[PDB]
Structure formats: structure tokens, C-alpha cells
UniProtKB/Swiss-Prot annotation, chain A:
A lipid is attached at residue 20 (S-palmitoyl cysteine). The M4 transmembrane segment mediates tetramerization and is required for cell surface expression. It comes from Rattus norvegicus (Rat). Residues 2-17, 18-20 dip into the membrane without crossing it. It is found in: Cell membrane; Endoplasmic reticulum membrane; Postsynaptic cell membrane; Postsynaptic density membrane. Residues 21-26 are cytoplasmic. Palmitoylated. Depalmitoylated by CPT1C and upon L-glutamate stimulation. ZDHHC3/GODZ specifically palmitoylates Cys-20, which leads to Golgi retention and decreased cell surface expression. The gene is Gria1. Ionotropic glutamate receptor that functions as a ligand-gated cation channel, gated by L-glutamate and glutamatergic agonists such as alpha-amino-3-hydroxy-5-methyl-4-isoxazolepropionic acid (AMPA), quisqualic acid, and kainic acid. L-glutamate acts as an excitatory neurotransmitter at many synapses in the central nervous system. This is Glutamate receptor 1. The postsynaptic actions of L-glutamate are mediated by a variety of receptors that are named according to their selective agonists. This receptor binds AMPA (quisqualate) > L-glutamate > kainate.
Amino acid sequence: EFGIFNSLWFSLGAFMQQGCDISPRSLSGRIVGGVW
Amino acid sequence: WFFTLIIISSYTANLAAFLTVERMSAEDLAKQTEIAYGTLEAG
């Protein structure tokens, strides 16, 4: 579900402390989410 | 979301300045005019 349009939405949502409708499940995705 | 992020930060920042500021003569009476000063008559 982490397509290019969804990934931009999650990254924007995370930066503004509003959360998102999806979260990463793989280790690689969670490492990116952690540092972002 | 961007409007919310700036406004909430502004409220917290201005409140911090508001709380910080309050935490921190005859010439003076003559220079100003907001306070009226008088004497006793025939004294």
C-alpha cells in the first residue's frame, strides 16, 4: 500500500505530527520512518 | 495541517514569552500625564 503517492502522503503527515492511515511493516521501511 | 502547525507553535511560543516577561520619582511624575497630581489649596 506504500505506493509513490501514498509514501509522499505518509512522509508529509509524519513531518506535521498528524499521523497517517498507513505505517511501514518491513524493517527497511521502519528504519526510514524512524529517522524521518 | 500546515496552518495548524504554525498556529499551535505560535500559541506556545507567545505564551512562553508572556510568562517569561512578567517573571523578570518626582521627575517620572512630571514627565508623564496619565496620572494627575495635585496639592492642598491654601497650603
